[PDB]
Symmetry: D3
Amino acid sequence: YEGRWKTVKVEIEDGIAFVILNRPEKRNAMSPTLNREMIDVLETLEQDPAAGVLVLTGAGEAWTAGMDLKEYFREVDAGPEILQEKIRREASQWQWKLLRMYAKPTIAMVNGWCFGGGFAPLVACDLAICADEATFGLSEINWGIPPGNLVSKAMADTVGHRQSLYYIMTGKTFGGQKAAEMGLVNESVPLAQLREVTIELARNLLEKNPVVLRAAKHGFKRCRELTWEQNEDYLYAKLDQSRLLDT
Amino acid sequence: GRWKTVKVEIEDGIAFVILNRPEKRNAMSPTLNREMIDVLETLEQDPAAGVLVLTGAGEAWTAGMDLKEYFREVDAGPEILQEKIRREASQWQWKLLRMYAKPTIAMVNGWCFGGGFAPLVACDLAICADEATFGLSEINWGIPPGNLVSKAMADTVGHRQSLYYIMTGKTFGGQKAAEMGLVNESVPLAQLREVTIELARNLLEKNPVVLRAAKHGFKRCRELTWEQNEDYLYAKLDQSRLLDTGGREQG
Amino acid sequence: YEGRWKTVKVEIEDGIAFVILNRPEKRNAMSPTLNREMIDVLETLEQDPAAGVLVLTGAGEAWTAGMDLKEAGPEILQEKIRREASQWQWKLLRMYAKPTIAMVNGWCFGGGFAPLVACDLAICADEATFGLSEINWGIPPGNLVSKAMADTVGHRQSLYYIMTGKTFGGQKAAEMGLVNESVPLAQLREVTIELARNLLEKNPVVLRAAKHGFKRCRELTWEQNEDYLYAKLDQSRLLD
Amino acid sequence: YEGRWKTVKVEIEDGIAFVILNRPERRNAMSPTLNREMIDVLETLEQDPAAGVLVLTGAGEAWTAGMDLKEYFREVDAGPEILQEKIRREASQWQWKLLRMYAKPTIAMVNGWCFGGGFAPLVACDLAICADEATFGLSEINWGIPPGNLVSKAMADTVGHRQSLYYIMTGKTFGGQKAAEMGLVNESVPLAQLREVTIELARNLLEKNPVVLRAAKHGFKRCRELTWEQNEDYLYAKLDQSRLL
Amino acid sequence: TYEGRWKTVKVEIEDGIAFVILNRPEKRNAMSPTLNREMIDVLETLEQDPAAGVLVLTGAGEAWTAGMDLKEYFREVGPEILQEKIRREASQWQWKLLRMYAKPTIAMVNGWCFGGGFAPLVACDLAICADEATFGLSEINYGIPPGNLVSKAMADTVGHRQSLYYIMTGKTFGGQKAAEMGLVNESVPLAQLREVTIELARNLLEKNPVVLRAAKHGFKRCRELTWEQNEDYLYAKLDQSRLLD
Amino acid sequence: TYEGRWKTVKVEIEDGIAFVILNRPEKRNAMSPTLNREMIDVLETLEQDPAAGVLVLTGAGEAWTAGMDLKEYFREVDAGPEILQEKIRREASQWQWKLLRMYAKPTIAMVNGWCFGGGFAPLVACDLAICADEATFGLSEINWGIPPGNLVSKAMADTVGHRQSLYYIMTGKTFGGQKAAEMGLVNESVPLAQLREVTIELARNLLEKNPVVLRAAKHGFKRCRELTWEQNEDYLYAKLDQSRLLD
Ligand SMILES: CC(=O)SCCNC(=O)CCNC(=O)[C@H](O)C(C)(C)COP(=O)(O)OP(=O)(O)OC[C@H]1O[C@@H](n2cnc3c(N)ncnc32)[C@H](O)[C@@H]1OP(=O)(O)O
Ligand SMILES: CC(=O)SCCNC(=O)CCNC(=O)[C@H](O)C(C)(C)COP(=O)(O)OP(=O)(O)OC[C@H]1O[C@@H](n2cnc3c(N)ncnc32)[C@H](O)[C@@H]1OP(=O)(O)O
Ligand SMILES: CC(=O)SCCNC(=O)CCNC(=O)[C@H](O)C(C)(C)COP(=O)(O)OP(=O)(O)OC[C@H]1O[C@@H](n2cnc3c(N)ncnc32)[C@H](O)[C@@H]1OP(=O)(O)O
Ligand SMILES: CC(=O)SCCNC(=O)CCNC(=O)[C@H](O)C(C)(C)COP(=O)(O)OP(=O)(O)OC[C@H]1O[C@@H](n2cnc3c(N)ncnc32)[C@H](O)[C@@H]1OP(=O)(O)O
Ligand SMILES: CC(=O)SCCNC(=O)CCNC(=O)[C@H](O)C(C)(C)COP(=O)(O)OP(=O)(O)OC[C@H]1O[C@@H](n2cnc3c(N)ncnc32)[C@H](O)[C@@H]1OP(=O)(O)O
Ligand SMILES: COc1cc(C=O)ccc1O
């Protein structure tokens, strides 16, 4: 994995795969290059047995500062309209299509700045711990666009109706304690203890049968979309599928 | 003096829509309903108005549906009159209001009961007075919550707490309303107007069409799957770029 | 109702029907027998004018320690066994005719979460312990357990407790929104009763419309609900 | 109602309110005037006990040639955005917001051309009889737009998946017989028999209790959206609402 | 044997085919609450009976079912709460147990099918009728909208325009029209009804029962789910089938 | 030239029409994990290729497709790691409907022959379909001892009536091209000798449309099925306006 990707670094320690967004000089802004590389990282790590749990984090002071306004636009305008379709799909592909129902447990370790488009993979990640010192913001409004991709849904899934509208509509920033209070993350802790808390959580997840864990996490995310009567069918099916697959 | 039961004041781009039946604690009559439609429709076309703040005259925000004024009409006409009277209440309370073209803030200055919860939650954001008292009194009056009241709770207040207040009909204060997610914030009545106006000013700074796309998109995306939203939210983004004449000039 | 059921007791006092899960020796673990009796209990108390409100609680230290793992046959029996669990836990309970309160006096694990959340309201003891232990036993949550969490507990929290299987006490359950409130055990029965009596002062048909409407409206758009809620209100006025 | 509206006529006979789109010189294209008049028509006939069933039909050769290319699109598109959104909302308001769950039974009586945007109120009307000679078309694609407003959903509700995509994607026209065969309408008959057949259906409808008829038709259109288990609750509520009212 | 076991219903099993015979022919198999309760017991019993691999729901005499029993419902109902129970019992067998029943089910519609009979007709997986069978949603003419899951049964099997026509008019229709509309798989002469049904039952009996159950259930659920929801759901059913088989 | 490019598929473009030919006719175009991976590549490639205006999905030889490859797609995957199964299923879904159902360009299935089981997903993902009278269809899954996997049962639900769908799923009975057209599974059935001509005529019609506009129209229709009227008022107007932008 060393030197494999230009904009991401992967460090696998004893079952825990740290996936590190690695454009710290651009505050880990999500360029099309990065989107395409994160797709390869998630696919590759899915099939790597040494990666039992994934921790998504950022190099330097940012977690991610959102979409790369420059490189995204640079590539999009260099091509015909239909290029935008491909470029948008690639962002969705790693941010949540692969990530939201990922085969392996995932934890967002939010060490610093998290803006705009970063909310989608933040929520696609199963659980999330952040630094008190981290700063969040849905700054789309202040740039003259509504939240794009699945950002507004990420909010809708995790943060109350009123709170979600306040932050989307104002673009106002908030810290890690506020993010845990509003339910965006599981926990906010001082940055000095971020890695410790995250690793403790990752090892607790490593204790469980991966196939059983997958059945439980996926079934929970899906169940929110189904009625009780539909869930009776769906949730038992996931139960039974787990039993078949769990080996 | 355009409306009998509602006053509108526009200052620096903020339209204060003031429910104006204080003698009745701003209860919602069919007249009020009909006039609120006209108000929302009027203000929508008013380039001077960039944010709406929905508040009450006197001590109440609204004490809810005016039940005498409702029966006055419903029992003087055939069954089908009820259809029209309900459509009119819904029309301003949420059909126009929930997905309103312009940003909306409920400034809950006081009493908020019953049917008041629907326009409350229809309003995008809400700041109340600490001193405000809310309640879902419907149950003690012998009816389940009418109109969209129960959905308004569902959208903003946890399952357990929603059931509790619907089932018991117990009242709660602004702090507890903030706590449960019904409103954004609760502040002392003495600071309610200034707090709402600073929020309102923030919102006037935003591109209107873009704010519209953002707030509508959020409310609708709650109903859709992630994969349905991929399609819907990008559509709202692209629509916002077209309709905003405007410009989006970050870039 | 004395002596009527092997694994449950019903005790009615002045409109309040206490339904007491009664296998203390196995921490009120839910067996096929218990499931069948609970169906009978629910159907009976429905038609009994003496029960105005049901409070679902547990004998001894447990509320319920979840499905009974010991209490094998042809494949088709599993269909019936699963259906019987569902039938009382939420098919009858979630939209029950009468107001229901869970009184969580102690241990609440696994499959207990389903009737916990089907119960309309819930008060628990500070000393009670809850957990979604499924994961530690090697199954995801069965039946309606995960949806039960989805309805009451935030996304992050739900996933945390489901994925880790970590236990939490009464105060945390109230803070998460799992139950309405947590009181010391010493005051659980009194606080529960005060709530029950409050609900007993309502018109039952109206209360029913109100609590059914709210649970269903969560599933419907605002436009659907304009139709559905007014329908429930009018149905209420008919059934008076 | 004689001379009440500029672009629509209402002629009531024996409990049947014939609502006639009345711009035959513009093939009944739906302009902002017509849209606003149609709202007033719907609201008025709702409260008029003389009207027991509405028959939606068109003066001249057309049922409706769709939205007014000039007055609804071209003149508006250039004007204030906020007015555009209001104009769209007014089109919806009569075409389906009031019409799809209308208090009273509704029949579209499709005497001729039906294009584009006419498909929304077509499907909002409970039942529909067209003439064999009527021609239908989702011509939007050929005019450079996808179908606007609720037109696509009007198709989705009544015409199977492959046929809907076919007619939306090609914009090919189809006659009344094909319209009945695909499920867009209930029946197609020669134009010479259209009024008779439609009146006979209206008379059947007029024999039913209005409130019960409302509960049944509303309930059906809503139930398509709900699960069986949600429907147990909802449909029994509609039945009980019906008994109350 | 189940001979003489129930008052209003008969079960006769031949070679794995369980004929469930609605048996109040003097009352055209009207569904009283006694019949509803007995049907609950029948479904629960046949579920666990390995002799029964497929269930065929038919009616004694000239009716399949004339719908809900007017007299015996309106009788057994005061106190209000009793209606809750009676309505449940009706739903319990008609579709709560039946629609997602563990074994494959076939409606064999030999005659009259009205009103409330539509719920179990469509809960049954497949259906064959006689050309001579007559159907109608007479609820409108009795002054109630269709109750229970009747309107959804229609919504699942019959096109939008046709369902509204029949619901709003209450008009009757024969076996051939029932098949044309999609309400049943096939209409055949009465003399061929039993053997066609049996031929189909024999085909179903040849399948792996657990697999058949996954397949029929997953189809009916998938109608309610989006494609992305069904990727998850349908693989879960497949994998569940592989476990349980 | 796409000549020689993929092992198990061919692309031939004539005048804006990209014929995508499933090409294992000696295996009746059974869909192996190789063919699935390659079809993902084909669709991403053709999406960005302005020479391709409309895709026609068809089979070499006597088959359209005989369904998933029992040997390469089921048997051999079953012998592999569990986590591999996850990727294999995803890669089948990826070309069959995740890219294909809302594909950017118009699609037509040209069903020249056998179409079984797994075939039904990409059959209905394709916007339009013409088949030969001589083609034979079947949901054979039940007779191999599985329920329909992947999206097959949803493909049937979207296109074929409730009664007919259960009948064919439950019995496993085959049916011909005319009956496929009658049931709503395809748009039309013609003799095989005319299949190509009729398909190209349709494709030529489709190529006259503004692609961005055609895309909005077919996508909006598919999605509107899932939404209520009030929802569609929002969504369908968003599609119309997005179209006016990108157009
Ligand atoms: C669609 C959406 O995602 S909307 C969200 C878009 N992103 C944002 O609104 C956040 C934008 N960035 C910021 O607010 C600031 O960069 C912060 C708070 C993240 C960091 O502040 P600072 O520590 O003062 O660093 P600074 O602003 O100098 O940025 C460092 C470099 O990162 C670049 N950068 C930061 N964020 C982005 C971004 N989203 N896209 C592209 N470049 C970025 C900066 O332009 C700067 O470039 P340069 O020094 O090579 O010219
Ligand atoms: C499908 C689902 O519901 S997920 C499973 C959810 N439930 C659980 O994880 C709980 C399992 N049980 C426990 O963890 C413990 O019994 C506790 C914490 C509830 C209480 O523990 P203690 O106070 O130490 O008492 P203890 O464990 O000895 O319980 C005594 C009896 O209860 C029985 N019991 C408790 N829960 C269950 C159960 N869920 N199934 C079967 N038996 C149970 C024990 O087997 C034991 O039986 P015995 O006396 O014949 O040997
Ligand atoms: C979303 C939408 O609704 S997109 C638009 C969809 N509508 C259509 O495609 C139909 C367009 N119209 C036509 O194709 C034809 O007019 C037909 C087939 C209906 C009738 O054809 P003809 O009998 O030959 O009449 P003709 O085309 O000359 O129209 C006669 C008058 O009606 C007008 N007219 C017809 N349709 C419309 C329309 N949709 N909007 C505005 N005016 C219309 C014509 O402009 C002409 O008026 P004018 O001479 O004052 O300019
Ligand atoms: C809620 C719902 O399901 S809506 C009610 C649905 N049913 C209907 O609309 C039709 C009711 N019945 C009929 O129309 C006719 O009985 C038919 C067409 C089924 C058969 O007609 P006929 O063969 O001429 O027989 P007839 O009308 O004499 O009925 C025979 C007996 O069955 C009884 N019966 C038939 N249907 C019902 C019913 N739904 N409920 C109670 N009794 C019924 C009749 O009252 C009659 O009783 P009797 O001889 O003991 O006095
Ligand atoms: C979920 C799913 O998709 S399960 C798969 C469902 N598919 C089916 O039920 C169809 C299976 N195939 C058949 O029934 C037949 O092969 C038919 C009707 C399509 C064509 O029959 P024929 O013309 O007699 O050709 P035949 O059966 O000899 O097939 C030719 C070769 O294709 C292979 N083949 C055909 N279908 C498949 C398939 N689905 N998977 C793997 N290999 C296949 C055969 O094994 C044979 O291989 P061989 O020559 O290497 O031994
Ligand atoms: C496209 O993948 C699959 C298709 C099928 C069709 O029956 C079954 C299992 C699968 O994995």
